[model samples]
Target chain A: PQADYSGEIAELYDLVHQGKGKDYHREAADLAALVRRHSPKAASLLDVACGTGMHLRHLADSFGTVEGLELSADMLAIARRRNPDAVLHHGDMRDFSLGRRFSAVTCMFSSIGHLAGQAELDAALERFAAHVLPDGVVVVEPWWFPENFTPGYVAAGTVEAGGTTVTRVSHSSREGEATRIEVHYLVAGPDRGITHHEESHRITLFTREQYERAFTAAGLSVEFMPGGPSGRGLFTGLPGA
Target chain B: PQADYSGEIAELYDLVHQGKGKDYHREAADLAALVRRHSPKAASLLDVACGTGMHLRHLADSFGTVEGLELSADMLAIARRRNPDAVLHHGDMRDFSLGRRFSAVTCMFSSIGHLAGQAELDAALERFAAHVLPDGVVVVEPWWFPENFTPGYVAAGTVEAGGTTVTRVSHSSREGEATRIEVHYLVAGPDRGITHHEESHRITLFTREQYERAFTAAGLSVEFMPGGPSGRGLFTGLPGA
Candidate 1:
């Protein structure tokens, strides 16, 4: 069954990504710079699965028109507050259509890993390819391969923001070719009873050859970019002639 | 008159230094490592101005005997609980003596900076020298030098422990050669009312030359180390014949 990540789990996306050691912001900026350098004539960009719209705010300054597509409306509400001037669409990456093309499309933060099977992954890649203009860039940041996955690892830490303190414990387990990650949070407040929230997701391990083949089948020429928005490498696809 | 810091202030010391960062448990391990490295032959260690006796607990495990000398009785009580077997003395660092000498002595976390004037600083150094054996190692970690002191620098953060969240905001101001640090804390509990506590301290900035002269005048040879107990350098003094 799909996890019920309706409330606190959605809010945690911002807290965890923006909290201590927010190296992701720099990575996003670097990716934007690369896009600006490669597609100098391009003025529009799209952020697929833009959780909480942090990257949208960062891209707003560089692009004249920026659009974000996310599945969670709760997260989109926060993103709207953060980037009111940008266009945001609430839709799933598997089969979302805006009927418009953009100069660059970015699927960052390992959001591509949400597709657990080959058919689902291919569908998402096809959606990204269909949404990009001629010579436009489509960047996909996938989960780490099985070779990089560490199983049965537990990491626990605490972070405080404003008046709220959040303690988090995370565990990762590997099953066959996929890695499952589970995170638990304990939030404490002065008058509020301690609240608990948990989220779990699975990431498939696709080899470089398999990923390139999938992109090629999606009507795009694939270029293996070592790092994604976070400077960790990713795969980039260009429109085929 | 000196502040009667025996009650809530002593309790604050433990609360402030409880966890991983900010003079936490690592400070204790750092002290133990320093004594073990510098005074391998020493059988016992005495930590004057021991605050909450964090270092004493770690030293007890490594040495034949470990003792703590503190000015605040309340703080001594907490230290005693942590090191139940170690002897704890309640007295001032300047004028108090235990009628015994130790093979190694340490004053950590810039505790020596609590003394205000040159006279108090000189007296504390003399007392430290008098309480140590001929070849004993004396390590004193002083506050930031005046040249390095930057006033109007503010650092605000929150930490949570045992279901209680403590928010700390600190500001530093420079007056002549002394820097005044003011720290305010707002502690919140589940059912209890919010408590506010403020503490101010003055730390004298002594140059390298002044520090050397003071130790030499007390019949000790001094060397400046750059960090603290974390393999970072701090200053250490060795008495000469």
Candidate 2:
């Protein structure tokens, strides 16, 4: 959800995500499979914050047209390499528009968590609604609900890429209404020795009601599905005819 | 390296491993790329101790004929579903033979670490060598070296599959020459509610020299690379000219 990924992080993006318990292959395919089940005629799709184009790459076969909107150039570099057949653009979720619409639109992997608050989430949803055909499908996987938030959580794992081993340790705590996470990284690379880095990331902990409100505000009818692709929730919206 | 993977685990196998840190695509593609660079004629491959046929499925285009040998039926079940084209057998790496030789043999993801002592390690290598053609190559990605052992290492992450959310926490410590790891899992699936599971996995710590010695004892000329796919290290061997 971060706006930028560069250097070693970009190189090991997929690996670190895998260590963080992201199954792109399963999750990506699962999201597409849901579209086929719910909206069978959806032949084109768009993925927001499509870091590394994992979904677009896999959805290539299922969709007649697959495109992506990502935030980081570093990530786009790798995504392009992985899915050269798909069209990808560097853009923000809240304001960017592709000047076209698709039958199915998805913002998955809780990428909407990067938005600061409810207003940003609503704006982002409106943008997604604008890029979808009337009666077309829109799906947003939101972050953990405030009620489901665990104040204290810890995770760590290692990944390797281009002769570099990157290990990350993360600790999460609730800071007011937001979820605050601090991640520490230990990177060991050839001729580079070992280095440590620490970064702090924050995401809004919105309630299920808040997410539903955003969808309605965007002029879409939303249904919240429990235990969706990411186990958080999938808020599927259908633009009112 | 656990001998058994059954019950709910087989259903959530891919999810749990993603948390425990497994990158089949990255690691699999990397292994194939290396083989293409060093040994261009490596047309056939046997993935010894291959779990779920992850590598074989990805290596379809890289190698002409690909096969796998694994011990767990649960894992093999998932493997067959993923790779119907490749031949995957339910057999142990230490003492199983398919009565056929491969141009290249690979024991990846440190699966060889399951062997307890030096004698077992030597035996495993000899077994691997026995299944490979003379002058063919064998690549073994090993577990963490003794010096690389970090006591009190903790890692945790969550993954969701089939309406199931699995969270796992692992703590590692070194007891004598073996690295002991205890992993605890909390799984919440559809109608099953939430259940907890704990597993203990141990891998013997072998030094670089010890790994090389076992390769030599297996009638191969071995070289210890600084780092390999998973960044632990790669022990490559040629079964003499």
Candidate 3:
């Protein structure tokens, strides 16, 4: 059976995410900038599976209107709590239909990894393409290609706050084309023992050809960019634009 | 001579940090929870070298009072701008002496890296121990030991922003007990072609024995707890009351 990360997973998401540093926000702003550049006149955006709405605040700051769709209600609760005025819809990414199109659609952080098979991937892309208006853009940040990933890795670090400290340990493994990461956190007090928490996530590994084929099959014109947000080329697709 | 990261570096700190993730804040919250568990009555905190005040805000929310000490005027300028009402003092971590004592003192993000030698390290610890009140606590987060670090490491990633993309390439080298990290950022914009920015940082290596000795010489009882906020065991020092 596929791992069911529905209920408790949301709380785990918050714990595992603590002390993420500044890189997270940088990527969010980078995505917003891409939207602004590609569709300068674009006004509305739909962020699929917007966990905790970390990027929504920035998106709201940059765009005319912002909306989010998420699977986990607990995760969406935190996002709503952070953004009181945002329009949030809770549903699965593969089958949700908002009954309206948007100027831009974004699926980031490799949320697509949650889809287990080719059918799910195709359905998710179809949903994205269907919900985007002509001249709109759909941006997907997929899991890193297997060729680009270094598996069986471990990284540990620490961050201090006053009399307390938090240490982070991350482990990565590769299963077929997917990378599974488990992060464990230990919070230490001055005299007390430690409190432990952990979260695991899976990221799908799709070849470049697979990505292009899926996008085109969903009725979108796709272009693969070579570099990431900091460098030049970005793999992007325009839906009936 | 080391490059003076005074003026432009200060501004770049915020620019480069914009949209970085809240992993630090999450880490800070976990740390704060731990402190509350041990020193339930503790109310005030002093964060040394509080870059951008990310942790300070969280500390202020968790504690009764929050203060900061920093050496970089440019950095302090940004901190003050971010927290206009915050009590911020300009001073070196080694020599700056404020008359007031705090219930807790924090130095995170491996800010200790700036102290290049044993003498400086001793002075910093002495200053920390002196400024903390009786029954108070102090936490210092140091860089990973060189023996524990893997050298010749490379991490490449991308961040996308306003119609432009930026790529980051990070390389690390270990010589003896010190590690040197070099980061090259390439930014591509519609108006601005690929611009390359490079910076390098060197972190000193100190073994567990050396770390324990430093705290002892500073007249503080120490406990080295391993594991990070996420992983199993990584050492974190909690100075005794």
Candidate 4:
């Protein structure tokens, strides 16, 4: 199971990254460009695992309609604020049916790496493929490949907004076949003084071949791109081999 | 007394600020420029409260001989690494003697605000003045003036270096004539899962007039500069009126 970022962490996810200079609009533009390249007539988009609907907010401008699917209710609640006109759904990426197909489906921000193993990865890709129309495109931003990941990596970020300060620190190391990231956060404000919370995330270090297998198994012709917004690169799939 | 930043805090201080994009070289250049404006032939310099020697490492180039006087031995120990040839002494700013004067003496980073009140402020300025030659310049970066401070302010920062992540969060509020900052830090690495630390800092919010009065009492002609490295402004003192 993925780490629970459903409480205070969800509330701060946008603020902290936004302060750290994460350009959501730029990323949205890049994703939109990639999606358009595969499906020239792509009109509607579905963003899977869209935390807080940050990408969806800007992606809406590139397409006629855009919707978000997020598992965390806390994050979805905030996603609603920016994308008031869009229909946002609460569902997991591996198993969920909106009962509707889209011209383009995207699972971004390396959210695909949260799957436990090959079975889950294939299931998630199948779900993404099923939601896209024939001739439609599916774009998945994969996490670091096993060869690319650096064990014992550490990162820290801080941001201040709305009279509150949020600091996040993370340590990542190889555990079995996955990367275990232990994250700690401290939120402080005049009203609340200070609060601390932590979470452990075990994201699979899925190899490039494993990702291609999942895409092929889902009945899609997949191509890997070298560079992406996260530096982990992107994978694009066209429905049908 | 200032907050005890002599333990683990000192070790991570350089790493944290370096990650946050603090421009030590630019600050050093700016400070040196200001000092040379007052004393054209400024050849020697002393950095008071020089934490981890980030500033001293750059300031050393501007002067023929540069030294640092710090209250924390732990911080001084790190300062020694970057400044191998410079004579870094372990001593407090308010009370220390090297039995020699320098062409320029600087206390940057709003460190002068760490003093308790007028008495300690006067003592520190007197000490800074005594360590400078007659024509030497004394540059003290003052903290926020009472009217400038925002009570209940919050800030957070994170840095990653050498396989460790350090996140620092702080909440600041008014406490009588002083500003009380409660800071919390979370440091994590592969070698040592995660460690938490906290420190309470009570730094006085000295008025501009109080700072000028201290400089006058210390037998130095004082003039306030509008803007400085920290935005709180700078107080420059000459030997005579």
In terms of TM-score, the best-performing candidate is 4
Compared with the true structure, what per-residue lDDT tens digits does model 3 show for residues A105-163?
98876677788767888899999998887878898877666666767655555555654
Across all models, the iRMS values in order are 13.6, 10.9, 16.2, 1.9
Candidate 3 residue spans exceeding 4 A from truth: A1-18, A161-164, A190-193, A227-234, B1-241
Using all chains and alpha carbons, the TM-scores for the candidates as numbered come to 0.52, 0.50, 0.47, 0.66
TM-score of chain A of each: 0.92, 0.92, 0.85, 0.96
Q: What tens-digit string does per-residue lDDT give for candidate 1 at A1-241?
A: 2353457777776676555456655766777787766676877899999878888888877778899998888888888899888889999999999999999998987787777678888888899888998868888887777656556655555576765666555566776777777665656443342455667777777777767777887888887776454544688788872
Fnat by candidate, in order: 0.00, 0.00, 0.00, 0.67
Deviation of model 4 at A238, angstroms: 4.2
Candidate 1 colliding pairs: A226-A233, A227-A232, A227-A233, A228-A232, B225-B233, B225-B234, B226-B233, B227-B232, B227-B233, B228-B232
TM-score of 4: 0.66
Q: In candidate 3 chain B, where is summed lDDT lowest over 10 consecutive residues?
A: B229-238
In the range B189-219, model 3's lDDT, one tens digit per residue, is 4344334455667777776666667778777
lDDT of 2 at A32: 76
DockQ of candidate 1 is 0.02
DockQ of each: 0.02, 0.02, 0.02, 0.41
Q: Total clashing residue pairs per candidate?
A: 10, 0, 50, 0
Candidate 1 lDDT, B155-235, residue by residue in tens: 555566765656555566776787766665555544342455667777787776766666777888888877665332477
- For candidate 3, the docking band is incorrect
Order of candidate numbers by lDDT, starting with the best: 4, 2, 1, 3
Give the winner by lDDT: 4
